[PDB]
Amino acid sequence: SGFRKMAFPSGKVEGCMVQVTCGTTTLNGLWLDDVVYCPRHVICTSEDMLNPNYEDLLIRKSNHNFLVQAGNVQLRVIGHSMQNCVLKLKVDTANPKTPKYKFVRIQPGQTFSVLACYNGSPSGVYQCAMRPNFTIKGSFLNGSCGSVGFNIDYDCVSFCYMHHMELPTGVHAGTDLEGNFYGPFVDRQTAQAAGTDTTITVNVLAWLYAAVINGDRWFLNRFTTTLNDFNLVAMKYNYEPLTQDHVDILGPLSAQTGIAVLDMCASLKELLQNGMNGRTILGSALLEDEFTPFDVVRQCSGVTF
Amino acid sequence: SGFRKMAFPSGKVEGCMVQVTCGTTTLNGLWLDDVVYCPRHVIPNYEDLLIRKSNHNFLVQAGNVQLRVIGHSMQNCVLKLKVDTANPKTPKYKFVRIQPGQTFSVLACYNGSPSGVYQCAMRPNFTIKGSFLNGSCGSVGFNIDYDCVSFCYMHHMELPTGVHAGTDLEGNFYGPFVDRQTAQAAGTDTTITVNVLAWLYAAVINGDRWFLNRFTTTLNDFNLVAMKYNYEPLTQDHVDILGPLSAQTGIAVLDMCASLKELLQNGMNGRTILGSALLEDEFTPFDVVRQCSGVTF
Ligand SMILES: O=C(N[C@@H](C(=O)Nc1cncc2ccccc12)c1cccc(Cl)c1)[C@@H]1CC[C@H](C(=O)N2CCCC2)O1
Ligand SMILES: [Cl-]
């Protein structure tokens, strides 16, 4: 019993965190095999930030300009290249702590663990989701650039995010490990703003099934809904449209609890209309959207209470 | 910017998790140097049950390697299995007993394999609101200070309300619990007042100031109000501990107490604080200072 926002054990990622310095700038790098991946903005100067020409800044650098530190050991840089918004530093030593890994690009609504680091040293681990507006509501301070997001399903680490910047609203933007940004963001200090955010509907439904699994049914009703009627109501509360794919994905939880997806949608519609009336669901007074259907199946029991 | 329930990096603890099997029971063990610590309920008159066991009855597995048990002893509710190999991944560590209100990280494990890490607090009723399934027994709670891992909790059982109970690493239970199948219930819980205040300071640091007012209160008047809302009494020690955050934000502790008093008597009025519609009590004053400063390990 119980339901917590749970992160993956961070050990396999901790053994990959390094410190990358270029001139006066220091940030974090990810050391996998003989390559260190880091945000390309480490090569910028205090002016460059507005309209940096990364190709022009990089051509002026040599291998010895990049200082890479793994613990108390200096790694020698023997090559460098840029792939989109990520700088790849070829080093002379392969990381002996390199886990089995993949680089995966996630879609909005997906969750991942973040190992927040400063000066190549891990400070904390937390769980979060890629928002529909492609930002993440993380907890980052200056020097956290280069911290990574990941999932560890089985013994393989799937790297999905690298931190690049904080937007004016306090939310965060970054790239996949191939340097492609999530969202319409650029690594420039130009006026950029996150689009209007929405609630991840499929995740709220999954979390309502998790509450039924742990023994709570106060929010259910005797009604059902069509998918179309549910979306017309949901859009009025800034909820993402629920697609037939989302309904298919919720199938296992529907079978385990005995509650049809469109009947759980009818209960969600009623919760949006009425609020909670002093009650909570899994210790929360708000509708929680940072647990996917897969996270619920992983954390909750296979036997409903 | 941002404020999350953050756990310590779990790597130093992951390298200590092992699987302990005795007969039909399998649970988790903590392998430090040449000793494996695990709940004694893996074997009730525990002395009588233990005397009938030999070293070869305990099967200990570290990854795909079988560890040979060469001795066994009991310390309170923890079983200590002497093994033939010292753990080469043993970090610098201490066994510490925490007080209610203090927070720690939990590395939840099944069959000696870590599955997740989460942050939580020791409730005033000595239970923890964790996330554990059958097979989680032996999972541990910890904090990190520089390079030293302070082990403070080992999971033993789930209570009928869904909350969890366990011991320090010396086998002494937190709370009036015993390690057996019998009618046990968690006492009425209270809110950790000093932690809610710390989280209100964290909200001010992150730009949330709608709840601030021009008023102050005496410590006595605040406690008379807080006792009415099932909040733990706020002591002068708690006020002293909140000193740094008071100096950083410019809001005196008793000034912030008058804000909490208004939130308790009037609610949030459709508003949230740090993305929450409830008053959050699982961040200590130190957790707030650490997260809003960037301390590393
Ligand atoms: O804000 C800065 N850096 C980046 C940033 O956004 N970093 C941060 C990330 N997360 C949380 C943060 C919270 C508080 C402050 C910073 C945070 C940033 C800014 C603009 C565009 C990009 Cl891609 C990256 C400052 C100002 C320039 C300096 C910097 O990064 N330099 C590069 C080389 C010369 C100095 O550090
Ligand atoms: Cl995805």
XYZ file of C-alpha atoms and ligand atoms in Angstrom:
639
model
C 0.000 0.000 0.000
C 0.910 3.678 -0.437
C 1.623 5.828 -3.500
C 4.638 8.071 -3.826
C 6.261 10.063 -6.603
C 9.090 7.579 -7.023
C 12.327 8.091 -8.914
C 14.597 5.362 -10.327
C 17.707 4.469 -8.256
C 20.324 6.967 -9.521
C 23.566 4.955 -9.051
C 24.012 3.972 -12.717
C 23.740 7.683 -13.688
C 25.916 9.026 -10.808
C 28.895 7.057 -12.192
C 28.568 9.029 -15.488
C 28.460 12.619 -14.134
C 31.487 14.816 -14.915
C 32.341 18.548 -14.743
C 32.983 20.392 -18.046
C 34.803 23.756 -18.048
C 35.369 26.021 -20.960
C 36.967 29.341 -20.069
C 35.001 30.774 -17.157
C 31.890 28.537 -17.607
C 31.444 25.309 -15.700
C 28.518 22.861 -16.161
C 27.787 19.084 -16.074
C 28.620 16.444 -18.656
C 27.520 12.851 -19.191
C 30.503 10.474 -19.666
C 29.487 7.306 -21.558
C 32.238 5.070 -23.061
C 34.942 7.536 -24.404
C 32.532 10.479 -25.043
C 31.346 13.322 -22.773
C 28.005 14.891 -23.802
C 27.211 18.413 -22.579
C 25.149 21.537 -23.595
C 26.945 23.343 -26.443
C 26.282 26.694 -24.639
C 29.364 25.908 -22.460
C 31.405 27.510 -25.338
C 29.455 30.867 -25.100
C 30.716 34.142 -23.554
C 28.625 36.705 -21.554
C 27.774 38.516 -24.826
C 27.288 35.473 -27.156
C 24.112 34.467 -25.272
C 21.749 36.730 -27.362
C 22.733 35.599 -30.904
C 25.565 33.053 -30.600
C 27.053 31.518 -33.749
C 28.065 28.148 -32.306
C 29.897 26.997 -35.424
C 32.017 30.190 -35.368
C 32.683 29.836 -31.583
C 33.552 26.094 -31.870
C 35.973 26.463 -34.839
C 38.117 28.732 -32.570
C 38.480 26.025 -29.917
C 41.092 23.367 -29.536
C 40.817 20.132 -27.479
C 42.924 21.570 -24.635
C 40.479 24.494 -24.141
C 37.876 21.981 -22.732
C 38.675 20.858 -19.149
C 36.817 17.681 -18.123
C 36.942 16.476 -14.514
C 35.712 13.020 -13.380
C 35.849 13.054 -9.570
C 39.382 14.189 -8.784
C 40.802 13.008 -12.154
C 41.320 15.223 -15.191
C 40.163 13.555 -18.436
C 42.168 14.409 -21.576
C 40.024 15.683 -24.491
C 41.225 14.195 -27.850
C 38.353 15.354 -30.106
C 35.198 17.458 -30.282
C 32.124 17.758 -32.440
C 28.682 19.330 -32.261
C 25.437 17.423 -32.858
C 22.504 19.878 -32.853
C 22.581 21.630 -29.361
C 24.950 19.081 -27.742
C 28.721 19.184 -27.662
C 30.437 15.752 -27.820
C 33.901 15.604 -26.321
C 35.999 12.595 -27.272
C 38.123 11.689 -24.229
C 41.167 9.365 -23.894
C 39.564 7.112 -21.250
C 36.407 5.046 -21.588
C 34.174 5.277 -18.471
C 34.545 1.938 -16.609
C 31.201 2.653 -14.879
C 29.307 2.972 -18.223
C 25.998 1.169 -17.780
C 23.968 -0.547 -20.517
C 22.201 2.472 -22.124
C 20.038 3.883 -24.979
C 19.234 7.453 -26.055
C 15.441 7.796 -26.325
C 13.343 10.868 -27.309
C 10.171 10.998 -25.140
C 6.740 12.487 -25.958
C 4.808 14.964 -23.700
C 3.100 13.212 -20.802
C 6.032 10.789 -20.333
C 7.777 10.773 -16.947
C 11.462 10.428 -16.009
C 13.882 10.773 -13.094
C 16.226 13.752 -12.926
C 19.627 13.596 -11.250
C 20.298 17.267 -10.474
C 24.115 18.041 -10.450
C 26.407 21.015 -9.763
C 30.101 20.916 -10.702
C 29.830 17.323 -11.896
C 28.568 16.283 -8.396
C 25.056 14.826 -7.944
C 22.962 16.601 -5.307
C 19.491 15.097 -5.626
C 17.055 12.915 -7.496
C 13.417 13.657 -8.328
C 10.687 12.416 -10.624
C 8.948 14.644 -13.168
C 7.025 14.701 -16.482
C 7.526 16.302 -19.904
C 4.651 18.833 -19.908
C 2.350 19.134 -22.964
C 4.020 22.566 -23.606
C 7.410 20.681 -23.726
C 8.771 22.267 -20.555
C 9.555 20.456 -17.287
C 8.672 21.819 -13.827
C 12.070 20.953 -12.328
C 14.121 22.192 -9.410
C 17.280 23.685 -10.849
C 19.707 26.455 -9.918
C 22.554 28.085 -11.935
C 25.215 25.394 -12.637
C 22.639 22.583 -13.064
C 23.007 22.723 -16.924
C 23.936 19.324 -18.247
C 21.938 17.398 -15.547
C 20.050 14.473 -17.107
C 16.645 12.808 -17.171
C 16.325 9.030 -17.453
C 14.291 5.871 -16.987
C 15.791 2.516 -15.917
C 13.458 -0.206 -17.113
C 15.203 -3.581 -16.497
C 19.042 -2.866 -16.193
C 19.293 -0.487 -19.206
C 19.423 3.279 -18.600
C 17.374 5.202 -21.205
C 18.641 8.796 -21.320
C 15.844 11.111 -22.478
C 16.710 14.639 -21.328
C 19.604 17.021 -20.776
C 19.017 20.335 -19.023
C 19.876 23.513 -20.957
C 17.921 26.475 -19.558
C 15.388 28.081 -17.269
C 12.548 30.119 -18.818
C 11.193 33.394 -17.220
C 8.307 31.520 -15.546
C 10.683 29.230 -13.613
C 10.111 26.157 -15.815
C 12.901 24.317 -17.619
C 13.821 23.510 -21.183
C 16.287 21.080 -22.644
C 17.132 18.528 -25.313
C 17.170 14.780 -25.940
C 20.739 13.268 -25.861
C 21.064 13.900 -29.657
C 20.801 17.694 -28.952
C 17.294 18.259 -30.347
C 15.266 20.560 -28.076
C 11.887 19.532 -26.757
C 9.541 22.391 -27.711
C 10.023 25.549 -29.770
C 13.054 26.632 -27.754
C 16.548 27.746 -28.767
C 19.749 27.944 -26.713
C 19.746 31.810 -26.967
C 18.923 34.416 -24.276
C 16.215 35.829 -26.634
C 12.621 36.461 -25.421
C 11.207 32.927 -25.183
C 8.100 31.894 -23.299
C 6.453 28.582 -22.536
C 3.104 28.080 -24.269
C -0.098 27.721 -22.165
C 0.197 24.445 -20.244
C -2.466 21.749 -19.992
C -3.199 18.776 -17.694
C -2.107 15.330 -18.927
C -5.537 13.655 -19.012
C -4.344 10.055 -19.576
C -2.060 10.433 -16.490
C -4.866 11.789 -14.241
C -7.026 8.787 -15.306
C -4.163 6.369 -14.513
C -3.779 7.981 -11.050
C -7.580 7.604 -10.452
C -7.181 3.853 -11.286
C -4.212 3.739 -8.824
C -6.554 5.178 -6.130
C -9.167 2.477 -6.852
C -6.372 -0.189 -6.636
C -5.326 1.116 -3.233
C -9.004 0.911 -1.981
C -10.615 4.300 -2.662
C -13.815 4.676 -4.733
C -15.571 7.774 -3.297
C -15.217 9.668 -6.650
C -16.867 7.079 -8.903
C -20.427 7.679 -10.211
C -23.087 5.623 -12.097
C -22.521 7.478 -15.365
C -20.598 6.830 -18.555
C -19.597 9.196 -21.372
C -18.802 9.210 -25.037
C -15.152 10.082 -25.831
C -16.342 13.193 -27.703
C -18.477 14.512 -24.811
C -15.585 13.896 -22.380
C -13.175 15.943 -24.563
C -15.685 18.820 -24.929
C -15.898 19.048 -21.107
C -12.071 18.417 -20.525
C -10.963 21.170 -22.929
C -12.907 23.701 -20.757
C -10.657 22.834 -17.758
C -7.410 23.031 -19.844
C -7.084 19.235 -20.018
C -5.335 17.630 -22.993
C -7.612 15.806 -25.471
C -7.963 12.086 -24.666
C -7.340 10.043 -27.813
C -8.333 6.455 -28.675
C -4.621 5.539 -28.105
C -4.927 6.768 -24.490
C -8.090 4.658 -24.042
C -6.277 1.560 -25.426
C -3.272 2.230 -23.120
C -5.632 2.354 -20.074
C -7.046 -1.116 -20.997
C -4.985 -3.195 -18.508
C -5.964 -0.911 -15.522
C -9.611 -1.017 -16.694
C -9.502 -4.847 -16.685
C -7.774 -4.997 -13.268
C -10.284 -2.696 -11.499
C -13.456 -3.564 -13.445
C -14.053 0.122 -14.327
C -14.429 0.936 -18.056
C -12.183 3.849 -19.307
C -15.245 5.924 -20.332
C -16.824 5.278 -16.864
C -13.574 6.534 -15.236
C -13.844 9.530 -17.659
C -17.385 10.219 -16.303
C -15.965 10.262 -12.748
C -13.151 12.642 -13.898
C -15.769 14.953 -15.489
C -17.654 15.036 -12.173
C -14.468 15.726 -10.165
C -13.736 18.733 -12.431
C -17.270 20.040 -11.867
C -17.459 19.469 -8.092
C -13.944 19.618 -6.753
C -12.968 17.297 -3.886
C -15.248 18.653 -1.080
C -12.567 18.497 1.641
C -11.523 15.002 0.529
C -8.202 13.792 -0.897
C -7.188 11.097 -3.378
C -3.921 9.309 -2.527
C -2.932 12.104 -0.100
C -3.525 14.848 -2.671
C -6.149 17.631 -2.786
C -5.410 18.258 -6.533
C -5.787 15.940 -9.553
C -2.289 14.471 -10.089
C -0.964 14.211 -13.664
C 2.716 13.192 -13.309
C 2.157 9.347 -13.132
C 1.718 7.526 -16.449
C -0.360 4.333 -16.927
C 2.995 2.406 -17.002
C 4.214 4.045 -13.704
C 0.931 3.055 -11.981
C 1.240 -0.589 -13.119
C 4.903 -0.596 -11.921
C 4.292 0.900 -8.441
C 0.846 -0.448 -7.463
C -0.020 -4.056 -6.571
C -1.487 -6.439 -9.175
C -4.367 -7.145 -6.716
C -7.018 -4.389 -6.140
C -7.996 -3.676 -2.491
C 13.617 27.954 -9.502
C 11.336 25.036 -8.698
C 10.618 22.972 -5.595
C 10.438 19.190 -5.680
C 10.374 16.398 -3.101
C 14.011 15.505 -3.609
C 15.792 12.367 -2.482
C 19.539 11.870 -1.942
C 21.427 10.153 -4.821
C 21.026 6.410 -3.974
C 24.205 4.955 -5.560
C 26.174 4.463 -2.314
C 23.192 2.495 -0.864
C 22.453 0.479 -4.070
C 25.927 -1.144 -3.765
C 24.895 -2.532 -0.312
C 21.541 -4.170 -1.180
C 21.398 -7.993 -1.017
C 18.643 -10.701 -1.021
C 18.192 -12.780 2.159
C 16.225 -16.064 1.956
C 15.384 -18.249 4.976
C 13.084 -21.181 4.245
C 10.111 -19.792 2.353
C 10.706 -16.061 3.289
C 12.690 -13.778 0.987
C 13.444 -10.138 1.899
C 16.232 -7.485 1.557
C 19.478 -7.160 3.490
C 22.035 -4.381 3.914
C 25.633 -5.633 3.331
C 28.202 -3.390 5.077
C 31.797 -4.705 5.562
C 31.409 -8.501 6.371
C 27.897 -8.220 7.939
C 24.407 -8.393 6.388
C 21.669 -6.642 8.418
C 18.040 -7.683 7.850
C 14.657 -7.881 9.766
C 14.763 -10.778 12.259
C 11.225 -11.805 11.130
C 12.909 -13.539 8.110
C 13.303 -16.544 10.513
C 7.160 -15.700 18.012
C 10.066 -16.502 20.351
C 12.916 -15.260 18.180
C 15.675 -16.688 20.428
C 14.013 -20.146 20.227
C 13.568 -19.862 16.425
C 17.177 -18.627 15.916
C 18.847 -21.332 18.074
C 17.372 -23.948 15.659
C 19.073 -22.340 12.631
C 22.459 -23.023 11.182
C 24.526 -20.677 8.973
C 23.686 -22.698 5.813
C 19.917 -22.120 6.348
C 20.402 -18.391 5.447
C 20.890 -17.861 1.671
C 22.397 -14.445 0.866
C 22.687 -13.214 -2.715
C 24.608 -10.127 -3.921
C 23.706 -9.733 -7.600
C 24.414 -13.140 -9.144
C 26.918 -14.085 -6.390
C 26.084 -16.275 -3.404
C 27.590 -15.007 -0.127
C 28.601 -17.679 2.415
C 27.134 -17.069 5.914
C 29.764 -17.887 8.623
C 27.917 -16.549 11.704
C 24.649 -15.071 12.971
C 23.402 -13.014 15.897
C 20.398 -10.883 16.837
C 20.423 -7.265 18.058
C 16.907 -6.197 19.092
C 14.641 -6.698 15.963
C 17.594 -6.982 13.473
C 19.388 -10.142 12.408
C 23.137 -9.773 11.713
C 24.603 -12.324 9.331
C 28.383 -12.609 9.361
C 29.477 -13.332 5.785
C 32.839 -14.547 4.392
C 33.344 -11.543 2.081
C 33.567 -7.876 3.028
C 31.523 -5.641 0.663
C 34.057 -3.824 -1.564
C 31.396 -1.159 -2.268
C 30.938 -0.344 1.474
C 30.657 3.443 1.741
C 31.707 5.585 4.724
C 28.655 5.150 7.054
C 27.075 5.667 10.513
C 23.938 4.195 12.116
C 21.820 7.091 13.410
C 18.407 7.145 15.113
C 16.213 10.009 13.802
C 13.459 11.956 15.622
C 9.852 12.455 14.350
C 9.700 15.323 11.835
C 13.116 14.477 10.377
C 13.163 13.380 6.695
C 15.151 10.676 4.844
C 15.462 8.878 1.507
C 14.100 5.392 1.037
C 15.576 2.971 -1.473
C 12.664 0.520 -1.996
C 13.946 -3.008 -2.970
C 12.480 -6.393 -3.943
C 14.661 -9.565 -4.045
C 17.773 -7.503 -3.176
C 17.226 -5.342 -6.283
C 16.553 -1.591 -5.917
C 13.424 -0.447 -7.753
C 12.888 3.140 -6.645
C 13.945 6.017 -4.451
C 11.640 8.444 -2.648
C 11.812 11.033 0.087
C 9.679 10.874 3.223
C 9.416 11.937 6.869
C 9.171 10.118 10.177
C 5.624 11.096 11.254
C 4.973 12.323 14.850
C 3.108 8.951 15.370
C 6.386 7.192 14.322
C 4.987 5.723 11.124
C 6.144 6.577 7.609
C 3.725 7.123 4.697
C 5.805 5.043 2.282
C 5.141 3.067 -0.867
C 5.832 -0.579 -0.222
C 4.543 -3.924 -1.517
C 5.148 -7.462 -0.099
C 8.877 -8.257 -0.452
C 9.977 -4.688 0.385
C 10.986 -5.728 4.000
C 14.611 -4.829 4.706
C 14.515 -1.694 2.444
C 16.432 1.183 4.080
C 16.138 4.900 4.851
C 19.152 7.200 4.832
C 20.614 10.684 4.640
C 23.987 11.787 3.233
C 26.410 14.326 4.785
C 29.292 14.911 2.362
C 30.582 11.322 1.687
C 29.019 9.634 4.749
C 25.788 7.634 4.506
C 23.759 7.817 7.756
C 21.445 4.782 7.865
C 18.364 5.615 9.937
C 15.590 3.170 8.975
C 14.932 -0.422 7.986
C 11.457 -1.447 6.834
C 9.672 -4.227 8.785
C 5.897 -4.001 8.222
C 2.719 -2.405 6.900
C -0.052 -1.379 9.327
C -3.814 -1.806 8.487
C -4.112 1.862 7.433
C -1.463 1.436 4.696
C 1.325 3.235 6.622
C 4.707 1.639 7.372
C 6.679 0.765 10.527
C 10.293 -0.184 11.048
C 13.457 0.113 13.122
C 16.742 2.025 13.276
C 19.769 -0.118 12.097
C 20.319 -1.261 15.736
C 16.840 -2.992 15.587
C 14.948 -0.600 17.879
C 11.472 0.145 16.485
C 10.317 3.687 15.876
C 6.950 3.834 17.686
C 5.038 1.444 19.942
C 5.210 -1.398 17.448
C 6.300 -5.041 17.719
C 7.457 -7.353 14.865
C 4.617 -9.889 14.781
C 1.133 -10.528 13.346
C -1.165 -8.922 15.971
C -3.670 -6.036 16.389
C -1.471 -2.937 16.020
C -2.646 0.511 14.957
C -0.949 3.834 14.283
C -1.856 6.533 16.786
C -3.611 9.772 15.697
C -1.135 11.707 13.550
C -0.254 15.396 13.711
C 1.214 17.943 11.255
C 4.920 18.784 11.614
C 4.583 22.557 12.260
C 8.282 23.508 11.899
C 8.304 21.744 8.489
C 5.168 23.570 7.227
C 6.792 26.894 8.245
C 10.019 25.952 6.385
C 7.949 25.122 3.257
C 6.154 28.525 3.546
C 9.647 30.172 3.586
C 10.589 28.063 0.514
C 7.440 29.370 -1.203
C 8.473 33.005 -0.397
C 11.967 32.265 -1.811
C 10.286 30.925 -5.018
C 8.114 34.087 -5.335
C 4.819 32.905 -3.686
C 3.851 35.751 -1.254
C 0.021 35.982 -1.377
C -0.283 34.416 2.140
C 1.928 36.999 3.874
C 0.207 39.558 6.103
C 1.247 42.537 8.351
C 0.515 40.597 11.558
C 2.613 38.879 14.170
C 1.734 36.503 17.062
C 3.113 35.347 20.385
C 4.465 31.762 20.478
C 1.838 30.904 23.128
C -1.116 32.201 21.051
C 0.186 30.350 17.992
C 0.400 27.033 19.938
C -3.141 27.472 21.335
C -4.317 27.768 17.647
C -2.082 24.972 16.352
C -3.298 22.506 19.096
C -6.847 23.100 17.772
C -5.771 22.043 14.206
C -3.796 18.813 15.139
C -0.457 20.586 14.567
C 2.588 19.681 16.658
C 3.576 22.348 19.273
C 6.182 24.843 17.995
C 9.054 25.166 20.464
C 11.702 27.908 20.893
C 14.180 25.415 19.326
C 12.039 25.321 16.151
C 12.016 29.144 16.093
C 15.846 29.226 16.455
C 16.227 26.588 13.676
C 14.076 28.774 11.326
C 16.406 31.789 11.992
C 18.456 31.571 8.760
C 15.281 31.434 6.541
C 13.779 34.325 8.547
C 16.922 36.416 7.893
C 17.007 35.480 4.164
C 13.367 36.415 3.465
C 12.919 39.270 5.982
C 9.883 37.560 7.563
C 10.168 36.846 11.316
C 9.192 33.323 12.434
C 6.268 34.626 14.506
C 5.283 36.823 11.468
C 5.165 33.553 9.335
C 3.235 31.839 12.235
C 0.483 34.512 11.899
C 0.286 33.648 8.123
C -0.041 29.916 8.982
C -2.707 30.822 11.624
C -4.721 32.653 8.906
C -4.271 29.672 6.494
C -5.558 27.277 9.202
C -8.594 29.407 10.099
C -9.491 30.451 6.505
C -7.948 27.945 4.038
C -6.323 28.642 0.656
C -9.428 30.118 -1.127
C -8.855 28.317 -4.436
C -5.146 29.195 -4.369
C -2.055 26.937 -4.182
C 1.426 27.259 -2.629
C 4.260 25.617 -4.612
C 1.709 23.662 -6.701
C -0.026 22.274 -3.603
C -3.553 22.901 -2.245
C -2.531 21.367 1.151
C 0.021 22.603 3.701
C 3.132 20.470 3.045
C 5.027 19.124 6.106
C 7.657 16.716 4.693
C 10.479 19.289 4.071
C 12.607 20.241 7.089
C 14.254 23.696 7.474
C 17.569 22.050 6.386
C 15.980 20.434 3.287
C 14.673 23.886 2.235
C 18.122 25.508 2.691
C 19.885 22.617 0.856
C 17.518 22.584 -2.142
C 17.556 26.381 -2.427
C 21.457 26.385 -2.347
C 22.737 23.390 -4.388
C 24.654 21.174 -1.889
C 26.314 18.147 -3.649
C 27.548 14.577 -2.756
O 20.970 31.884 -16.972
C 22.143 31.565 -17.165
N 22.524 30.489 -17.868
C 21.629 29.498 -18.451
C 20.427 29.109 -17.548
O 19.268 29.383 -17.859
N 20.768 28.421 -16.436
C 19.904 27.872 -15.470
C 19.294 26.623 -15.598
N 18.387 26.121 -14.749
C 18.038 26.869 -13.712
C 18.560 28.158 -13.446
C 18.152 28.949 -12.345
C 18.701 30.180 -12.134
C 19.671 30.679 -12.992
C 20.086 29.953 -14.072
C 19.539 28.672 -14.343
C 21.165 29.862 -19.854
C 20.647 31.118 -20.152
C 20.233 31.427 -21.440
C 20.323 30.479 -22.448
C 20.828 29.230 -22.139
Cl 20.849 27.994 -23.363
C 21.263 28.916 -20.867
C 23.272 32.417 -16.603
C 23.471 33.704 -17.376
C 24.534 33.333 -18.424
C 25.397 32.274 -17.733
C 25.859 31.168 -18.694
O 25.201 30.151 -18.824
N 26.979 31.377 -19.413
C 27.274 30.560 -20.597
C 28.639 31.043 -21.037
C 28.775 32.434 -20.480
C 28.031 32.374 -19.165
O 24.539 31.729 -16.696
Cl 7.436 8.501 -24.748
